[PDB]
Amino acid sequence: DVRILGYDPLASPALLQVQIPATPTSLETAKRGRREAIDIITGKDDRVLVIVGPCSIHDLEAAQEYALRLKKLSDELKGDLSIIMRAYLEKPRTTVGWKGLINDPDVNNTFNINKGLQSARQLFVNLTNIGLPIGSEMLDTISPQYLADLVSFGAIGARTTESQLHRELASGLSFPVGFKNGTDGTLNVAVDACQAAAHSHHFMGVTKHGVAAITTTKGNEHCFVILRGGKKGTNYDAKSVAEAKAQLPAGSNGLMIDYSHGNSNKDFRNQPKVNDVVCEQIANGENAITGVMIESNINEGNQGIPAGLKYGVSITDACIGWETTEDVLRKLAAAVRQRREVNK
Amino acid sequence: VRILGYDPLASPALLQVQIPATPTSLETAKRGRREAIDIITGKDDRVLVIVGPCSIHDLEAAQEYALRLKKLSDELKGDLSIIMRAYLEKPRTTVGWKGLINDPDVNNTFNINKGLQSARQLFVNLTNIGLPIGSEMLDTISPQYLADLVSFGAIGARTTESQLHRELASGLSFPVGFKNGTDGTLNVAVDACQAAAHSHHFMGVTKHGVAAITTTKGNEHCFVILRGGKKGTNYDAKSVAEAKAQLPAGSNGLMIDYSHGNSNKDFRNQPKVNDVVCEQIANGENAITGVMIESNINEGNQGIKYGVSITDACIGWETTEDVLRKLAAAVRQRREVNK
Hints:
CATH architecture of chain A: Alpha-Beta Barrel
Shape of chain A: globular
Number of domains of chain A: 1
Strand content of chain A: 15-25%
Family (chain A): Belongs to the class-I DAHP synthase family.
CATH superfamily of chain A: Aldolase class I
Pathway (chain A): Metabolic intermediate biosynthesis; chorismate biosynthesis; chorismate from D-erythrose 4-phosphate and phosphoenolpyruvate: step 1/7
Number of strands of chain A: 11
Number of helices of chain A: 10
CATH topology of chain A: TIM Barrel
Oligomer: homodimer
Strand order of the largest sheet of chain A: 2-3-4-5-6-9-10-11
Pfam families (chain A): DAHP_synth_1
Helix content of chain A: 25-40%
């Protein structure tokens, strides 16, 4: 313990779950989000699954406002799109920086993780309680025990798609899991991850009672590849999509395309450009594209962490604002309708 | 719905009572760390060598290997500081045998409590003969059971980018080598060393086997391991010059893995990589402070024979002697250059 400063007590999952119960609405919402997401990625439904919302959540009330606008849009476009809100609680850093709402809910380097788990769970109940399903990046392998009952979708980030621990984690999650392609822009690691996660694994993990035990998973048949560009370039276009389709094994689920990150080339204004190219593929009969991801907030851009934060603006990566989001989604729903025409 | 179930797990503290370190084991681990630190931080002009099997599946074969390695270590100690690879955890490309801890019987029964007892008994057995050991830290819970015996940890190419493994390293009491990425570039290993040098706060399992919030202090003894990848091998002078060019101030010396990416998928290339690395060292390259060698009693591998790897192919004992004696010579030559 030369490099361990200390340990602080942590409430168990079971304890937090009693303290912050899911409402029946929250639970039905999470189940429905899972059902719709499965039906889409497995080709039973010809709608597109859309994971859309903030790069990260740092503000429960602004997250609620965003959610109410998203749910309204989602009610309008539900013939064409199954919408899940990005409610991301955990942020992998290039080196160091704010890791998200759980790790440091006060965003002031006090690292009050019990309050962070309380805030995260309260947030997930608040969003799902209005009938809006949520998804998050599953970065921590312990935190999902606190939150999994409320979640309809998990992502594994580009920096952890290759990680055996994250493939083991995904193999035991009760909802669909998207693996990002690697930061270098190649697909093989995400295809490999979906294979690995489809198998049962045995590994040490923390239970609802907060104790380590040996977990046996069943394997998760609802993992899919997310194309998110990378060093080798963007990969949302028809040729990259064809390339991806060629690498997918029998039994594979549909592809999801992330408009942001590697596919935006360091500029949120590019998300609508990626939309137009993806919509052209879909409208013209591409059925292997079953999902998209969009980094969207109330207002566009991002800001520094100095509290004196501007309302409704990301404190991590730059997002498109709400108004651009509505345009992009209506455009995407139009493309879904056209694809239906092509398929008849 | 996707959890079949949970089986009880002995706590780290329990297993530490059940399989105690000897005083020699503890001293050996401490010495291994001191020596590795002095090398990677430039205090000592010997080279640090992490050498031994791709993986351990057989404690008796590992012991006989250790006894040969400890004897060679005593011969070459003015020039090399040797730590044995005792790798218990193996990351797979998709699926396959994950190593001794996960499935000690190698038959898909997954008796993790027995794997942890075999792992700890193995680590005691090796350090008890005065030979320090090192392992890849894949599992973030496993180190609680074994850390007192370990002098070096590696983070594999597939997990150098993972925030969880950078957090882990920041709290380990020994030097940690981050492998470069599977694409063959070093940026992610440089970033990882930066990240692991900082204090972190995260949920982790304690010695009593319960989850708690850990605060780490940061690990200043992390270094980059050059291990090739898609982009090509990276053990040559140009690769080393490019690597030194991206190291921040305060960086530790580089380690070169002779195997994996650097071997073009062919264990017989490790002595060729040795020649090229020796030539740089002998001629005055002081940034190369460590090497890593996949070595066993007998050469090659086998699919799932005594002294032969069941994972990646290794060089055999005799080749290993020759490689390490040549390396030692290169170290002596570098001392001459630096005068």
